[PDB]
Design a protein around this nucleic acid. Structure first.
Lengths: 147, 266, 422
RNA sequence: CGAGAUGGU
RNA sequence: AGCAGAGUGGCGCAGCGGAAGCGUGCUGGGCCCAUAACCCAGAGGUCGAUGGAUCGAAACCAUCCUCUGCUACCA
């Protein structure tokens, strides 16, 4: 299987396409993990560091997240099988990088970590601005600027 | 058998060992560079901080690096420690052990001559040649492995003493079967692309002028990553000596086209 | 060598591989460690023969059946004759012209090295297809009237939509070219009717005049094959130029030159640029080596140059001749010009900025083409019909009769018109 | 002064 | 074509010239009233062809084979 990057658009010819995201449920009750297997390839296909899309699930779900250089596992704590992610797999696009003028997420970020500001720019119609101040992930991005 | 000059280890230096059992006060161990003699590591000497399980610091049959903290010569008692050992000293211990295991693998096989009835022949073959080849160098830090490497390039080392033909050939083979890939260790990188409209005639000097006064038979080896990235091998010399030929070759490669109306970055 | 050379010309999404194989037996390609797309996007070639039996048909190299291989489920077949002995009509080879307007300079060069055009048509976009003017108006301005049309990808298209295509084209050409080019239909999947293309390249196309004894002229476009293996890493074969001889007999060991050549290093500008010249080392055509050559045919010419010039097509659109030849070399240009009556390149159901071209200004860089070359042109002085410019690389011609002009009217240059030297 | 969360019948 | 990896003993990461190598996954047992954390033990075994030193060859060294990786070309 393969998919469009976002399912709010039903078009077969939509500009954005990527591999599936698949995960393992591991352990037993009071200590369950969900580990995301494709995360480095999905982060490469979306042109972002793999910390940002992993951190967004913990911000929405109300859950802990882990990262590890010794084992390369990316983890969201608790059981999040099937619909518990797959109803909202669009979200890292749908709550950040859709343009309000047109539904075309051909979109870039630049971080000014010395001055508490994240700049945003979409190629599709020239839409520019910043990320939202009520939204969760802004406090993580300013402490973790892009490569 | 023993691998070294002396009957017992000296205090405050590192030995290679193998673990045999674990008890209430410590682990019991056999030293490998000596003839399997007994010593022990106390449980207080394993770590600077709290131990979650002992089985993941030590288990039976694994090889290990430790210092000798005390010795009594008369009773044959040796105390060992692991809290002391830095990772550079563990690498140094593996080099001493590898240089010793290779020499011993020669002498143990060379001993399979005459009657070979007892370990007396092993101790007699260890004495004289192999012992006088490194007793002189204990302080500089060499072993008989270096004397064997000298005996490979010139057998006059062996001719200086009473000798056997296995002791000549097995000694040489346990270096040469590993040393014979004396492979290429320098190549040049050149950015040249040629202006010359006579090139198919003229560049056949730049391909061949790289060293003076050779035989007419002397080869060189030439390579290419892509057409604007020219590469050459410096007469198969090692990286300890070929640095002059490297600097000369790249100068000659540019000279034999700048002589011929070309111009390039120096 | 050859008697005539034919340019296969078209637009995006029309295909290439099946029809270029059908007319020649040769797959047009460029080597890359990557998948083959719908088009060969940049100028290429396909070597060929044209032959018959005693009765009109185009056989395979085994003469008894026309049996196909382009579709997995069927074996479309006919008998040209009972294993009859084949007869060659004439020696021919194909110029595989660019598949996209992005390469329009290289397309005008491809249209100049051909003696005649094949123009290719397909059902994949709406009826009034615009390249039917864009190529043929320039081809008439470079005086090459010899044209044919070939309807390729129509395997699932009805006869009324195939009509509506050629009829809206027949209405559209009224301001840009004469209608007098024959149309041949085929199948792209089944190889149906393809031997009528072979018959029409005998029926429509003449052999053109050239001088066999006047001073040598050659056009070059291609870096021909030189390969990595060798016991000497530099200059084992020397660089080979792919081109077509315009004028004069040619021979091995002759000194030949390229007119625009190169700008000399340590020059402060356009001064000290010079031709480049050498003895011809070898010749290639029709899968044979040669010692001698003639005007009017595609050929490979061997030279002493570094193969680092040949690992890519650096040699696109160059004019060559005998060492020390007369024809004037231009590094700056005096121009007079005229612009197209519509903006052109693509079309749909109604107007998309198709109005007349806005006038030129001095604060801009043109792409400008002469003979079978190309260069970038920067303005010294201009008016809406006339100007004076300086060139980022030199160019040459035997007479200043024509130029073709392209402007940065959007992100990449489009053709906007033509002109002459003053 | 090592680490010591949680609760269908 | 330049340089590098792989060729399971258990998914997956590929140690070092000693017959699993360690962090991890799977399966079972202990501890607790019980679940997680923690602790311990298991898994039928020449790892592509042809030569050579060895107590020994996936892992010391030649010569062939094939696909990837980065460069980037016999096509």
């Amino acid at each position: 299987m393969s998919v469009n990057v976002n399912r709010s658009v039903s078009d077969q010819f939509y500009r954005y396409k990527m591999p599936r995201l698949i995960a393992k449920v591991e352990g037993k009750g009071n200590g369950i993990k969900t580990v995301i297997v494709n995360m480095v390839d999905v982060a490469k296909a979306l042109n972002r560091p793999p910390t940002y899309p992993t951190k967004y699930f913990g911000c929405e779900l109300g859950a802990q997240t882990q990262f590890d250089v010794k084992n390369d596992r990316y983890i969201v704590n608790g059981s999040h099988e099937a619909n518990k992610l797959q109803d909202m797999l669009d979200g890292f696009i749908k709550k950040f990088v859709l343009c309000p003028e047109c539904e075309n997420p051909e979109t870039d970020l630049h971080v000014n970590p010395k001055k508490q500001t994240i700049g945003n720019s979409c190629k599709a119609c020239g839409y520019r601005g910043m990320l939202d101040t009520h939204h969760k992930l802004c406090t993580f991005i300013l402490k973790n600027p892009p490569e | 058998c023993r691998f070294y000059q002396h009957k017992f280890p000296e205090v405050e230096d590192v030995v290679m060992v193998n673990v045999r059992s674990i008890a209430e006060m410590g682990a019991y161990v056999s030293l490998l560079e000596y003839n399997n003699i007994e010593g022990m590591i106390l449980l207080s000497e394993l770590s600077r901080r709290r131990i979650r399980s002992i089985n993941k610091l030590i288990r039976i049959g694994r090889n290990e690096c430790v210092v000798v903290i005390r010795v009594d010569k008369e009773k044959g008692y040796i105390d060992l420690s692991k809290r002391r050992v830095s990772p550079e000293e563990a690498i140094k211990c593996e080099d001493k052990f590898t240089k010793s295991k290779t020499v011993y693998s020669i002498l143990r096989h060379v001993a399979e001559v005459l009657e070979y009835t007892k370990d007396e022949q092993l101790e007699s073959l260890f004495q004289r040649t192999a012992w006088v080849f490194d007793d002189k160098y204990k302080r500089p830090g060499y072993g008989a492995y270096d004397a064997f490497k000298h005996a490979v390039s010139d057998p006059s080392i062996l001719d200086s003493l009473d000798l056997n033909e296995d002791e000549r050939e097995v000694l040489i083979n346990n270096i040469n079967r590993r040393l014979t890939p004396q492979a290429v260790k320098i190549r040049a990188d050149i950015e040249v692309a040629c202006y010359g409209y006579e090139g198919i005639d003229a560049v056949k000097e730049a391909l061949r002028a790289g060293l003076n006064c050779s035989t007419e038979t002397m080869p060189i080896k030439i390579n290419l990553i892509a057409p604007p990235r020219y590469v050459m091998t410096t007469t198969t010399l090692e990286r300890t000596e070929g640095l002059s030929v490297l600097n000369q070759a790249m100068a000659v490669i540019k000279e034999k086209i700048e002589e011929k109306r070309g111009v390039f970055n120096v | 060598q050859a008697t005539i050379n034919i340019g296969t010309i078209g637009h995006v999404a029309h295909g290439k591989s099946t029809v270029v194989k059908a007319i020649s037996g040769v797959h047009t390609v460029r080597f890359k460690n990557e998948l083959e797309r719908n088009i060969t996007i940049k100028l290429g070639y396909a070597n060929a023969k044209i032959y018959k039996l005693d009765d009109p048909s185009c056989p395979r190299p085994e003469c008894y059946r026309s049996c196909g291989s382009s579709t997995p489920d069927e074996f479309p077949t006919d008998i040209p004759g009972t294993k009859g002995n084949f007869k060659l009509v004439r020696h021919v080879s194909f110029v595989d012209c660019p598949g996209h307007d992005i390469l329009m300079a290289t397309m005008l060069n491809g249209a100049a090295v051909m003696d005649a055009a094949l123009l290719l048509i397909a059902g994949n976009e709406s009826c009034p297809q615009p390249q039917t003017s864009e190529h043929l108006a320039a081809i008439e301005i470079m005086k090459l009237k010899h044209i044919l049309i070939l309807q390729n990808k129509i395997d699932l298209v009805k006869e009324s939509q195939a009509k509506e295509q050629y009829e809206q084209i027949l209405a559209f050409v009224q301001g840009t070219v004469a209608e007098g080019a024959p149309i041949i239909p085929i199948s792209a999947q089944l190889k149906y009717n393809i031997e009528v293309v072979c018959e029409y390249i005998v029926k429509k196309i003449p052999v053109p005049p050239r001088d066999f004894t006047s001073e040598p002229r050659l056009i070059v476009i291609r870096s021909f094959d030189v390969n990595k293996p060798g016991c000497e890493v530099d200059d084992l074969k020397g660089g080979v130029a792919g081109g077509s001889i315009l004028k004069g007999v040619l021979k091995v060991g002759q000194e030949i030159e390229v007119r625009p050549g190169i700008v000399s290093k340590d020059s402060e500008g356009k001064l000290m640029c010079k031709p480049i010249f050498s003895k011809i080392v070898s010749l290639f055509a029709e899968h044979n080596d040669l010692q001698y050559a003639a005007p009017g045919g595609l050929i490979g010419v061997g030279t002493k140059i570094d193969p680092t010039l040949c690992r890519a097509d650096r040699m696109v659109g160059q004019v060559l001749g005998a060492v020390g030849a007369l024809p004037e070399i231009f590094t700056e240009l005096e121009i007079s010009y005229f612009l197209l009556r519509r903006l052109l390149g693509v079309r749909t159901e109604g107007d998309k900025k198709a109005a007349k071209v806005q006038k030129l200004s001095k604060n801009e860089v043109l792409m400008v083409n002469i003979g079978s070359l190309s260069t970038g042109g920067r303005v010294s002085a201009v008016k809406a019909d006339l100007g004076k410019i300086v060139l980022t690389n030199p160019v040459c011609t035997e007479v200043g009769e024509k130029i073709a002009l392209s402007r940065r009217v959007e992100k990449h240059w489009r053709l906007i018109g033509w002109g002459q030297i003053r």
